[PDB]
Design a binder for this molecule. Structure first.
Ligand code: NI
Length: 341
């Protein structure tokens, strides 16, 4: 049974509610982005309308084999009508194709569902600037002040320099990058670009990246591992055992692996600067955990909410425990008192 924070009152609409079978009353199913906690239950057998971005649509079609007829892509930044209700899709600054959704209810209420986002001050000059929002359905993944992490630009700088230095000292080193979903592509793309290589990967992953409308992508990726010195692998394989095994496969082309695990937050953030980050090493293999986040930091979140001044906030993450809910409502009250709304 579908929970309440996935339902849009005064509409026949749900958001990211595909694991509950047929939801009573739902005339249109919205999908914010192509991550499996959110698309859970879609398949080639789904026959209700799905509304999403063009990219999320390429993925539903090609990866999950949803039929063309049930896929309704919408352009971003554009007023559209769906079963008599005005909507707009906005970029969420999460993974490719990820959107926020503005609903303009027939009674005059205005609702913002952020799906998954990384709040940014550029969002303050979207179509959000031009009117009030009564309810906000907020991604609260890191809604606690201990969640700090650097900018995406800083982390990429750190990775670029790390990889370039290591491979200039040892031309026979291989760089490996872990992945388990879409998102965070900039990590492996930035590294390959500085080394003048394409990124090599499995057929299943090449296919996924082929759906993403990335400019010049045929220039940047490939399925021929041998021609490439940046390889992608499943995140699970990013460990001393997994990498030793992979290295055996490359046929004495390489004598060293430098690998990167993009994580979200990790408690090493509570002590370390991105500049001071050190790998875990065993022999000819080093592994860096880098805090590349696609979710708001606590401060990025707080800033966006104090700017938007919503009348009511409904959290969509960390809702399962009384301690989490209580913690979050305290922070919402603080922000409101501090800013005067
Ligand atoms: Ni997500």
């Amino acid at each position: 049974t579908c929970p309440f924070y996935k339902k849009i009152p005064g509409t026949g609409f749900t958001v990211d509610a595909f694991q509950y079978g047929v939801v009573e009353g739902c005339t249109a199913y919205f999908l914010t982005h192509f991550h499996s906690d959110h698309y859970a239950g879609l398949s080639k057998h789904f026959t209700f309308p799905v509304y999403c971005s063009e990219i999320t649509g390429n993925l539903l079609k090609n990866k999950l084999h949803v039929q063309e007829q049930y896929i309704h892509p919408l352009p971003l930044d554009t007023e559209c009508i769906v079963n008599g209700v005005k909507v707009v899709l906005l970029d969420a600054n999460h993974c490719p194709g990820a959107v926020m959704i503005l609903f303009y209810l027939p009674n005059g209420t205005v609702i913002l569902h952020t799906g998954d986002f990384r709040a940014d001050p550029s969002m303050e000059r979207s179509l959000l600037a031009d009117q009030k929002v009564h309810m906000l359905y907020l991604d609260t993944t890191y809604c606690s002040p201990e969640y700090t992490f650097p900018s995406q630009q800083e982390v990429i700088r750190f990775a670029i320099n790390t990889a370039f230095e290591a491979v200039t000292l040892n031309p026979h080193a291989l760089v490996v990058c872990g992945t388990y979903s879409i998102g965070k592509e900039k990590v492996f793309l930035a590294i390959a670009d500085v080394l003048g290589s394409k990124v090599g990967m499995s057929q299943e992953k090449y296919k996924t990246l082929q759906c993403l409308n990335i400019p010049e992508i045929n220039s940047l990726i490939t399925t021929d591992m041998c021609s490439s010195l940046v390889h992608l692998l499943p995140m699970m394989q990013i460990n001393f055992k997994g990498l030793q095994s992979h290295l055996k496969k490359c046929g004495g082309k390489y004598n060293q692996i430098l690998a990167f695990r993009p994580t979200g937050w990790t408690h090493s953030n509570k002590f370390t600067r991105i500049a001071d980050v050190i790998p875990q090493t065993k022999g000819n293999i080093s592994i860096y955990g880098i805090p590349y986040s696609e979710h708001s930091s606590y401060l990025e979140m707080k800033r966006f909410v104090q700017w938007l001044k919503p009348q009511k906030i409904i959290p969509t993450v960390n809702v399962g425990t009384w301690k989490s809910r209580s913690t979050m409502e305290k922070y919402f009250r603080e922000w409101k008192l501090e800013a005067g709304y």
